[PDB]
A paper describes a structure:
To investigate how transcription is activated and how the AAA activator interacts with RPc, we obtained a 3D reconstruction of an RPi consisting of RNAP, σ54, the same promoter DNA as in RPc, and the PspF AAA domain in complex with ADP.AlFx. At least two distinct conformational classes were identified and the best class refined to 5.8 Å resolution, while RNAP was separately refined to 4.9 Å. Despite the lower resolution of the PspF ring, it is clear that the PspF hexamer is highly asymmetric and resides above the DNA with L1/L2 loops facing DNA and RNAP-σ54. Importantly, there are significant interactions between PspF AAA domain and DNA, both with DNA backbones between −24 and −12 and directly in the groove downstream of −12, where the transcription bubble starts. Significantly, there is density connecting RI helix to the PspF ring, in accordance with the established role of RI as the major interaction site for bEBP (inset) (Bose et al., 2008). Immediately downstream, there is density for a single DNA strand followed by a double-stranded DNA (inset), suggesting that a partial transcription bubble might have formed in RPi, in agreement with the observation in the RPc structure that the DNA strands are becoming distorted. First of all, the σ54 ELH and RI, which form an obstacle for the template DNA strand to enter the RNAP cleft in RPc, now move upstream in RPi, thus removing the blockage for DNA entry into the active cleft. The concerted movements of β and β′ pincers result in the widening of the cleft by ∼15 Å at the top in RPi compared to RPc, in preparation for the loading of transcription bubble and downstream DNA into the RNAP cleft.
The bacterial RNAP has a core consisting of β, β′, two α, and ω subunits (Cramer, 2002, Werner and Grohmann, 2011). The major variant sigma factor (σ54) forms a class on its own and controls stress-related gene expression, including heat shock, membrane stress, and nutrient starvation genes, thus playing important roles in bacterial adaptation and pathogenicity (Buck et al., 2000). σ54 brings RNAP to the promoter DNA through binding to consensus sequences at −12 and −24 and forms a stable closed complex that rarely isomerizes to an RPo. The activator proteins, which are also known as bacterial enhancer-binding proteins (bEBPs) and consist essentially of an AAA domain, use their ATPase activity to remodel the RPc into the RPo in order for transcription initiation to proceed (Ghosh et al., 2010, Schumacher et al., 2006). In this present work, using cryoelectron microscopy (cryo-EM) and single-particle analysis, we determined the structures of the RPc containing the promoter DNA from −35 to +28 with the characteristic fork junction structure of the RPc at −12/−11 (Guo and Gralla, 1998, Morris et al., 1994) and an intermediate complex (RPi) consisting of RNAP- σ54, the AAA domain of PspF (PspF1-275) in the presence of ADP.AlFx, and the promoter DNA.
Residue numbers in the entry:
A (entry chain C): 1 to 1340
B (entry chain D): 346 to 1021
């Protein structure tokens, strides 16, 4: 196929011989999938709103004979649009419908029902939706929830050996963690007794809680233990033989088995004497009496003669007790094994130490342990034991609870009961007794097989379920109040719990947050993030050791490279490109199947548990056409390591080498060359790059960003593409082809481009058309580019000329040196859009009118402001100028009746003293974008917003009127087509309407049917179009919901052009980011043999120093790319024919060995790529894969083909002195980065400013005041320099002393130079606070 | 929150003076408004304060001239926010530069520790007499050079100064120019004209010498020495008396900082101070003229790497074969394999170096003799501008092995150079251990800060009032003499300390009771009659002063010249700030600073200098086998030379069997006893 319509403009040259069979997924499918499964209707009852409604429902009061059955729910359409709602700045949520049905049962009468209750839907809460890009719209914010990672529910096997306990031995423990409710754990102590800890409470013995499970000691020893066999007939003392049950013996006498001695007295206990009686078949044997006293009794045997309780179970036997038991006529005797080799004497110390032998006293004791304040009344002990242990509501084992419970339980069926089971917890106690016995394997805490990610679906299901229970309580009170309630689900269900749970959840949460938007990159990699923060998964606020480490399970799913290099490290992760989430929350990664010796084309997704046992080959390997591997021993991995394995030991394949990296670090080329640390730093620096004016696609790249830019939702794509009709910067429309269309409604697809708009990062966003007109568009083609995007290809930075050189010491360490040429080329210039809102109103003194006067200010600002309205759009605001005038009532009336009706108050009318004006803060100057102000209902006499309220009506009327003309024009042309042969007239119909008078009469049928029809759908489309136009205009003029604490809201957008700056900062793809020392003239830049001064000058010492390899191959390969583009550009300077250049272009594509499917000239050869030569005339789009990237052989081969010297070094002359520098010099072209670190934003100079009423210290930075801060380190720095002055007057004169500032500024006059030492007022805040303290100190 | 702050970001001015500020025009006149109002007042260009405010708000061009009149001698003090030691705040003389940033002296940047990665900057304005003039007579960057932590003057002429002076001073066989008869001004005509390379071997140009041995007068001299043209260029930097290309040139390495120290040893004011930056001007000047570069051809991959990796892989294959047979345990097999990959990595490093010097050749005439290597990697490694043999070992040779979670060396080594494609799992373990390194280096800052909190909280108590109270108590000064080689000489410890008695040599004469110990007297007693390494010297800890400390008893030194005065914090803040850089970063895995469990005397007792090894505080016990054992528990084993000075002395524990107890001799690296 290789159609490549949308990529025909720029075909990025790809390298490497490793094909990708599985294409890059939409990659947002975790949030999109979680959302589409969060709102769904299914009969199976999948997790979501249906699972919550089925969980709580039916809602029945206690002894009320009334139930509430769920009709489930259906979602409606929101009141606003996506982009329009974001512009309005109101939360975006759809109402919920399909209320639950009620029921009524007759009291004292079984099955009696008065009537069935089916009620109409009731409004409950508001359910927000998600944009196609994965965001959430609340109050005009981005509101994305970070993915969560924590422990998956199931039986845990933990080591938990304390290093601070000093014991030096491992203490095993196991804890079952349900999805909700209390936690149940077991705890060892050196006494070797199983203990139980529930919700941090003190650990009780196993015998008291298991006794609370109503199991007698006979069932304890007979259940958890084997009673073996003991038989006594006339004191024959015959017992069964268990030669394979123990290794050992102690023999003080001979023991004969079936007429032959198995082990002689004093004979060896070795396996020679063991297997003799073991391999042979032996039956019960008779041995003397002395062997009973050593054994421990198992079952409970009492004397048959009298009724005493002697010889109770779990007790030691005495020599004199044998005579009392054996002579009592007991039928059989059960004795405990109790020999420690592979086992241990568990539960014994629990039975002995446990005070409560019965379930009742056990429930009373666990109740007293649960509640310290109230003594147990024994009445509620059963409900506390059941609801605390095994119950439907308080368990919530969910899916992974029973899945992992049966997996570790070694069960068969996956589905199980959602509550605790006695045999299940007994199995946990038995297998845990095996863990204490030494057999079995523990589980790793950091192993992701025990971890499951949680998303918006499960989290919003949890909070929404909690709110639904909060509703179930009050509704239970309402149904329990009355005996019979007709039409109950009306006023009984309140929306405040739902709207508070979902609106408080998505509104305020640790995971839910707005994003800082720099390029689509930071938006998508900020959209996909793994967080151990929030509920669960957070061990401590700081430090930690094994939690922050990297497990082998971090290979193919989470990216170890991308990471929060700041205070918390190793917590936030990034999923793989091909990673996916399983049904239980587990993470699966692709592996290609291999059958016999050939590699089949099917790929299966495997989690950590499944891929742990299987062996998978290394990412890079040799492949043959027959499917077999070239090398016999192929590098493969099984568990926690990798080694060469045979061709028969490889189960699966890794496909691409990019599975271990993420979208953030995957766009950094030559990863295998560059060091992982500096690649981590660069990947951390990729997200802060601000978009610039002109986006130039990176000439060195990957080819993943092609899918990232289109899959990021930032660019404007096209649905059902076709022949483009009209284009514009505001709007783009396309005529859809007739290949695939809907039969109804006809019409064409229209698009509204977003203009310059403020982001959360105060950046500039917009989309620009990539097509001219009349160009065919396919499905999925990007029409317009977002910020920092060029032709659907992501470029967040700008290339520029590069030379490696020390220059006159102006480049030191990481310092950067920028030419004035790029300064003159407008490159790196960006727009910063800050928003200014003046909103007050709300006064009991009367309303506040906007503008119309500026009190106590001359006409200077009145020239900028309109008489009845605000300032002109796109004006110059400098300093403290008033952008939007606002007044206040203030004193209003007074004596001299409001100054004689505002006579002495001049023309304000308020009276005087209105401070409500906006008054733009100092230091911020720029041009305003648009004033959105506010829109309210029933508001009149507002000159502001009139132009935009009219502009919206003209816009919707324009673009809707286009479709109206397409419809009415189409049907009118259909009339002109049907009137043929029925009395047609070209000269008449081509100069008049009606169509000869509604197709005349013709043959009767066409008259009434065709004419009456034409009028029917004509007036139907006209009247319907006008009705929908009025319905839309009503939505335009109705406005939104304003905050009740204000009458009118005013908000304005302003923009500033900020370009390359001397201090600034710059960053590389490989992690070098530094400040610019000085911007040098063009004349001072060294030039080549052609006299081309160099744009940038960096420090080559940082390559060995900071271990940055990829900069050499970056600059050199870039010099090759711009060598191709430079030679082709020279061909355009010579005006060569297409074919002569076409040969060099084709050679440029296919040079090297394979490593691409692209073929030049394939399609017509005279267009497309032919014009793409004029597209790439500036530079060549060369791409390298992450680990598959280019090699120095092909790099020097291409660069040598570009006529450039193969060594990548050109003889250079000084731009200053003109003399030649000794030795060749490395030059090239690399991709650079402009950040938000510019020193207009970072640097603020301040002298004197506002202070605070607390201690008289100023607030701090960003207030245009304060001296920043010199902390205790600077206090000890002045004590270190030995200056008493600077420190003493430092802490005192500036803040704690007014006398120092007054006398200081007074001494500035004539320069007395003295500064008052003063008495610190902050020290008077210490003396003050101490005076508030009960010990008050006063000076003498 | 202080006052009067620009809060700028550092830029690097190479030019102007070591102490001066590329204060910008934008940061200017914002904080200088009071001086501008008073300036227009006293000068009289304005009328009233409000009129001057109008003149400033209108941004007139006349305000810039008087603004310059104020700025030139009105200093600005500078500090980085994470401040550690006393030199963090320094006073410079500002001059306007167009821009939004501040151009800062890079040699001072190393003193601030600040980096150009974009760390913020706090810029404060001093107030009038005490601040401006106190920072003028005290806190200036040239007025404070010596650091009261290491004690040596702290200057970092690294990076393109080390590389530039390395390329400046060096020789080459053949090339062009041969020898030259011109001597003093050969750089102008010879270098700037044609035909003379920046460096040429075998040049007969004479160099004039100056002798300062005369009292208050310099004695000139001249003679013909063989020196390269670049060395003749470097000689023009300092007109004063020097070794004249012997110690004053060398290879263009840290020995340039050594000759900077010897030049600063005499008259630490003066053209010793001023024009010493000409080393920097020529350093970045002719370093930029050199234009060193790094590329694919720069690095060299040894061909022995394949044979070493293959041989080590075969040996380890035999090891895992023996483990498959059951003859070798898993532990000894693991540690053994670790040993083979470690020694093999060392082999790849050594062959890497061999191909770093002798593989690089230059073709001239027959080309068989070749010449010294011009490779930039070798210039950085040998010169010392940046990089290290370990980092280069990762560039070409093996990268080493570490595991953050396990803490042990992994059994899957990295066989791929950076130029070669790395394996996916190799990048996995590398980013693992690198993330661990980021966690540790990020963790050490807070712990070091807290350590400075405790130490500085203790150090506040020093008044340092009385001068000399005449105390007789002083510490006996003896060298550390630990291990095979002595760690530090006793001359550095006894240098610059008051001496009660301190008789060098066998008690002949040496120092008197009331004599101060300077560098000349202490160096004379250290060089002449060095057989006595123990001298009693007064210390700060022992002072007869009731309140405060005695400066004469503590010592004489500071950031400024010697003979310190009272009222100084001295070791309080100087030591509290001295301990900050030590704990700021751990050494390797931090187990180095810990007990290594392996020592010289612990394994095999060795001697430093050839001499008689004796046991101090011990009872010699001869045995029947002929060996010698110590009867007591705690003993001493020292190596005494013919002069009597102690070379190497280690405590001899009980149970050590030695071949010769006493009466014999020992050479360098001799092992008397060996105990497991």
């Amino acid at each position: 196929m290789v159609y490549s319509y949308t990529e025909k403009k720029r075909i990025r040259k790809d390298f490497g011989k490793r094909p990708q069979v599985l294409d890059v997924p939409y990659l947002l499918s975790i949030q999109l999938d979680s959302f589409q499964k969060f709102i769904e209707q299914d009969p199976e009852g999948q997790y979501g709103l249906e699972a919550a409604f089925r969980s709580v429902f039916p809602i029945q009061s206690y002894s009320g004979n009334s139930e509430l059955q769920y009709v489930s729910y259906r979602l409606g359409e929101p009141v606003f649009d996506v982009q329009e709602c974001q512009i309005r700045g109101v939360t975006y949520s759809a109402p919920l419908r399909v209320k639950l049905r009620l029921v009524i049962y007759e009291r004292e009468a079984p099955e009696g029902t008065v009537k069935d209750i089916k009620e109409q839907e009731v409004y409950m809460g508001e359910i927000p939706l998600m944009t196609d890009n994965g965001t959430f719209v609340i109050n005009g914010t981005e509101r994305v929830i970070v993915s969560q990672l924590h422990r998956s529910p199931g039986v845990f096997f933990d080591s938990d050996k304390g290093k601070t306990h000093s014991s030096g031995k491992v203490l095993y423990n196991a804890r079952i963690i349900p999805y909700r409710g209390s936690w149940l754990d077991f705890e060892f102590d050196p006494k070797d007794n199983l203990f139980v800890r529930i919700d941090r409470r003190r650990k009780l013995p196993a015998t008291i809680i298991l006794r609370a499970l109503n199991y007698t000691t006979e069932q304890i020893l007979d259940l958890f233990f084997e009673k073996v066999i003991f038989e006594i007939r006339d004191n024959k003392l015959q017992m069964e033989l268990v030669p394979e049950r123990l290794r050992g013996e102690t023999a003080s006498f001979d023991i004969e088995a079936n007429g032959k001695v198995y082990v002689e007295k004093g004979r060896r206990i070795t396996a020679r004497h063991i297997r003799q009686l073991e391999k042979d078949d032996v039956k019960l044997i008779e041995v003397p009496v002395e062997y009973i006293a050593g054994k421990v009794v198992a079952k409970d045997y009492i004397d048959e003669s009298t009724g005493e309780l002697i010889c109770a179970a779990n007790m030691e036997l005495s020599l004199d007790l044998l005579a009392k038991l054996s002579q009592s006529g007991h039928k059989r005797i059960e004795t405990l094994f109790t020999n420690d080799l592979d086992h241990g004497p568990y539960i014994s110390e629990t039975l002995r130490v446990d005070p409560t032998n019965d379930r009742l006293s056990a429930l009373v004791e666990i109740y007293r342990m649960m509640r310290p304040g109230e003594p147990p009344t024994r009445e509620a002990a059963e409900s506390l034991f059941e609801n605390l242990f095994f119950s439907e509501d308080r368990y919530d084992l969910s899916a992974v609870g029973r899945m992992k419970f049966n997996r570790s339980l070694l069960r068969e069926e996956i589905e199980g009961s959602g509550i605790l089971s006695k045999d299940d917890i007994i199995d946990v106690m038995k297998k845990l007794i095996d863990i204490r016995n030494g057999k079995g394997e523990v589980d790793d805490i950091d192993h992701l097989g025990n971890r499951r990610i949680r998303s918006v679906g499960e989290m919003a299901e949890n909070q929404f379920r909690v709110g639904l229970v909060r509703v179930e309580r009050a509704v239970k009170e309402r149904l329990s109040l009355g005996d019979l309630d007709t039409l109950m689900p009306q006023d009984m269900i309140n929306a405040k719990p739902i709207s508070a749970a979902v609106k408080e959840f998505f509104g305020s949460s640790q995971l839910s947050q707005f994003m800082d938007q720099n390029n689509p990159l930071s938006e998508i990699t900020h959209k996909r993030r793994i967080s151990a923060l929030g509920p669960g998964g957070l061990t401590r606020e700081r430090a930690g050791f094994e939690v922050r480490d990297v497990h082998p399970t971090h290979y193919g799913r989470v990216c170890p490279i991308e990471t929060p290099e700041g205070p918390n490290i190793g917590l936030i992760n990034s999923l793989s490109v091909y990673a996916q989430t399983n049904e239980y929350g587990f993470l699966e990664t692709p592996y290609r199947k291999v059958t016999d010796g050939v590699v089949t084309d099917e790929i299966h997704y495997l989690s950590a548990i499944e891929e742990g046992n299987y062996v998978i080959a290394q990412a890079n390997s040799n492949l043959d056409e027959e499917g077999h591997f070239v090398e016999d021993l192929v590098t493969c991995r099984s568990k926690g390591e990798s080694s060469l394995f045979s061709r028969d030991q490889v189960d699966y394949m890794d496909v691409s080498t990019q599975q271990v990296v993420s979208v953030g670090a995957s766009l950094i080329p030559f990863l295998e060359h560059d060091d992982a640390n500096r690649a981590l730093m660069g990947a951390n620096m990729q997200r802060q790059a601000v978009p610039t004016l002109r986006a130039d696609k990176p000439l060195v790249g990957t080819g993943m960003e092609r899918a990232v830019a289109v899959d990021s939702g930032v660019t404007a794509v096209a649905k059902r593409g076709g022949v483009v009709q009209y284009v514009d910067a505001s709007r783009i429309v396309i005529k859809v082809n007739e290949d695939e269309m809907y039969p109804g409604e006809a019409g064409i697809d229209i698009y509204n481009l977003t203009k310059y708009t403020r982001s959360n990062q105060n950046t500039c966003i917009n989309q620009m058309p990539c097509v001219s007109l009349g160009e065919p568009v396919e499905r999925g083609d990007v029409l317009a580019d977002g910020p920092s995007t060029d032709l659907g290809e992501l470029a967040l930075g700008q290339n520029m000329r590069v030379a490696f050189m020390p220059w006159n010491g102006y480049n030191f360490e990481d310092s950067i040196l920028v030419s004035e040429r790029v300064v003159q080329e407008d490159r790196f210039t960006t727009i910063h859009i800050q928003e200014l809102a003046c909103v007050s109103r709300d006064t009991k003194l009367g309303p506040e009118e906007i503008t119309a006067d500026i009190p106590n200010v001359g006409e200077a600002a009145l020239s900028k402001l309109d008489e009845s309205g605000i300032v002109y759009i796109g004006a110059e605001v400098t300093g403290g100028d008033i952008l939007v005038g606002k007044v206040t009532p203030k004193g209003e009336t007074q004596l001299t009746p409001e100054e004689k009706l505002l006579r002495a108050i001049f023309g304000e009318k308020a009276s005087d003293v209105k401070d409500s004006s906006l008054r733009v803060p100092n230091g911020v100057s720029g041009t305003v974008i648009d004033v959105q102000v506010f829109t309210r209902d029933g508001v009149e006499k507002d000159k502001r917003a009139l132009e935009i309220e009219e502009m919206q009506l003209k816009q919707a009327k324009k673009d809707l009127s286009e479709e109206l003309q397409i419809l009415e024009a189409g049907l009118f042309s259909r009339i002109r087509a049907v009137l043929v042969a029925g009395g047609v007239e070209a000269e008449k119909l081509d100069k008049l309407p009606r169509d000869r008078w509604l197709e005349l009469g013709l043959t009767d049928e066409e008259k009434q049917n065709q004419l009456e029809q034409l009028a029917e759908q004509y007036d139907e489309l006209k009247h319907e179009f006008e009705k929908k136009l009025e319905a839309k205009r009503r939505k335009i003029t109705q406005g939104d919901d304003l905050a009740p604490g204000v009458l009118k809201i005013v908000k304005v957008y302003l923009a500033v052009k900020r370009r390359i700056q001397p201090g600034d900062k710059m960053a590389g793809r490989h992690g070098n980011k530094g400040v610019i020392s000085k911007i040098n003239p063009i004349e001072d830049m060294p030039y080549d043999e052609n006299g081309t001064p160099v744009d940038i000058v960096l420090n080559p010492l940082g390559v060995p120093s900071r271990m940055n390899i990829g900069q050499i191959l970056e600059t050199h390969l870039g010099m090759a790319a711009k060598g191709i583009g430079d030679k082709i550009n020279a061909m355009l300077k010579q005006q060569q024919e297409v074919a002569k250049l076409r040969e060099f272009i084709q050679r440029a594509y296919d040079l090297g060995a394979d490593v691409r499917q692209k073929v030049d000239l394939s399609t017509f050869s005279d267009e497309e790529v032919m014009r793409l030569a004029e597209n790439l005339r500036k530079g060549m789009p060369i791409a390298t894969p992450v680990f598959d990237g280019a090699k120095e052989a092909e790099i020097k081969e291409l660069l040598k083909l570009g006529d450039l010297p193969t060594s990548g070094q050109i003889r250079l002359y000084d731009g200053r002195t003109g003399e030649q520098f000794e030795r060749p010099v490395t030059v090239g072209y690399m991709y650079m980065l402009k950040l938000n670190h510019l020193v207009d934003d970072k640097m603020h100079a301040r002298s004197t400013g506002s202070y605070s009423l607390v201690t008289q210290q100023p607030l701090g930075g960003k207030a245009q005041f304060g001296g920043q801060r010199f902390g205790e380190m600077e206090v000890w720095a002045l004590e270190a320099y030995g200056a008493a002055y600077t420190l003493q007057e430092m802490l005192t004169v500036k803040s704690d002393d007014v006398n120092g500032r007054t006398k200081m500024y007074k001494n500035i006059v004539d320069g007395n130079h003295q500064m008052e030492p003063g008495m610190p007022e902050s020290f008077n805040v210490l003396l003050k606070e101490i005076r508030s303290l009960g010990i008050n100190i006063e000076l003498e | 929150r202080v006052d009067y702050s620009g809060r700028s970001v550092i830029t690097v001015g190479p030019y102007l003076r070591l102490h001066q500020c590329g204060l910008p025009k934008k940061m200017a006149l914002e904080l200088f408004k009071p001086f501008i109002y008073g300036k227009l007042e006293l000068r009289g260009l304005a009328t009233t304060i409000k009129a001057a405010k109008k003149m400033v708000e209108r941004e007139e061009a006349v305000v810039w001239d008087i603004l310059d009149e104020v700025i030139r001698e009105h200093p600005v003090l500078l500090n980085r926010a994470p401040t550690l030691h006393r030199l963090g705040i320094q006073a410079f003389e500002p001059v306007l530069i167009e821009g939004k940033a501040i151009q800062l002296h890079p040699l001072v940047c190393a003193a601030y520790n600040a980096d150009f990665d974009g760390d913020q900057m706090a810029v404060h304005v001093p107030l009038t007499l005490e601040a401006q003039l106190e920072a003028r007579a005290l806190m200036m960057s040239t007025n404070n050079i010596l650091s009261p932590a290491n004690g040596e003057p702290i200057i970092v002429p690294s990076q393109d100064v080390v590389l530039g002076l390395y390329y400046m001073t060096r020789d080459c066989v053949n090339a062009k120019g041969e020898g030259m008869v011109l001597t003093g001004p050969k750089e102008a005509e010879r270098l700037y004209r044609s035909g003379l390379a920046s460096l040429h071997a075998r040049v007969k140009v004479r160099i004039t010498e100056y002798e300062k041995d005369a009292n208050g007068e310099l004695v000139a001299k001249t003679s013909l020495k063989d020196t390269t043209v670049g060395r003749a260029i470097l000689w023009m930097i300092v007109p004063k008396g020097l070794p004249y290309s012997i110690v004053n040139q060398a290879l263009g390495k840290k020995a340039i900082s050594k000759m900077l120290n010897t030049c600063y040893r005499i008259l630490g004011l003066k053209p010793t101070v001023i024009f010493a930056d000409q080393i920097m001007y020529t350093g970045f000047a002719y370093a930029a003229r050199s234009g060193a570069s790094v590329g694919i051809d720069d690095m060299v991959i040894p061909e022995k790497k394949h044979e070493i990796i293959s041989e080590a892989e075969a040996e380890v294959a035999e090891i895992q074969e023996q483990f498959q047979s059951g003859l070798v345990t898993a532990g000894e097999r693991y540690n053994k394999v670790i040993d083979i990959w470690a020694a093999a990595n060392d082999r790849v490093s050594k062959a890497m170096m061999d191909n770093l010097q002798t593989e690089t050749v230059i073709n001239r005439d027959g080309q068989e003799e070749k010449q010294v290597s011009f490779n930039s990697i070798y210039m950085m490694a040998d010169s010392g501008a940046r990089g290290s043999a370990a980092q280069i070992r990762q560039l070409a040779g093996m990268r080493g092995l570490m595991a953050k979670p396990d803490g042990s060396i992994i059994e899957t080594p990295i066989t791929a150079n950076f130029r070669e494609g790395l394996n996916v799992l190799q990048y996995f373990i590398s980013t693992h251990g690198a993330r661990k390194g980021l966690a540790d280096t990020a963790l050490k800052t807070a712990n070091s800060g807290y350590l400075t909190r405790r130490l500085v909280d203790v150090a506040q108590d020093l008044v340092v009032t009385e001068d000399d109270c005449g105390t007789h108590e002083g510490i006996m000064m003896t060298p550390v003499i630990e291990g095979g080689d002595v760690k530090e000489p006793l001359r550095d410890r006894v240098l610059g300390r008051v001496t009660a008695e301190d008789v060098l040599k066998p008690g002949t004469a040496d120092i008197l009771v009331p004599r101060n110990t300077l560098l000349h007297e202490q160096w004379c007693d250290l060089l002449e009659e060095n057989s006595v390494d123990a001298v009693k010297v007064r210390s700060v800890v022992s002072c007869d002063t009731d309140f405060g400390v005695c400066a004469h008893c503590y010592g004489r030194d500071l950031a400024r010249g010697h003979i310190i005065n009272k009222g100084e914090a001295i070791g309080v803040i100087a030591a509290q700030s001295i301990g900050e850089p030590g704990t700021q970063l751990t050494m390797r895995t931090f187990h180095i600073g810990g007990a290594a469990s392996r020592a010289a005397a612990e394994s095999s007792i060795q001697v430093k200098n050839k001499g008689s090894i004796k046991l101090s505080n011990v009872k010699s016990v001869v045995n029947s086998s002929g060996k010698l054992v110590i009867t007591s528990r705690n003993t001493e084993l020292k190596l005494i030379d013919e002069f009597g000075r102690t070379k190497e002395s280690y405590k001899v524990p009980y149970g050590a069997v030695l071949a010769k107890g006493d009466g014999e001799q020992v050479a360098g690296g001799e092992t008397v006893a060996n105990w497991d």
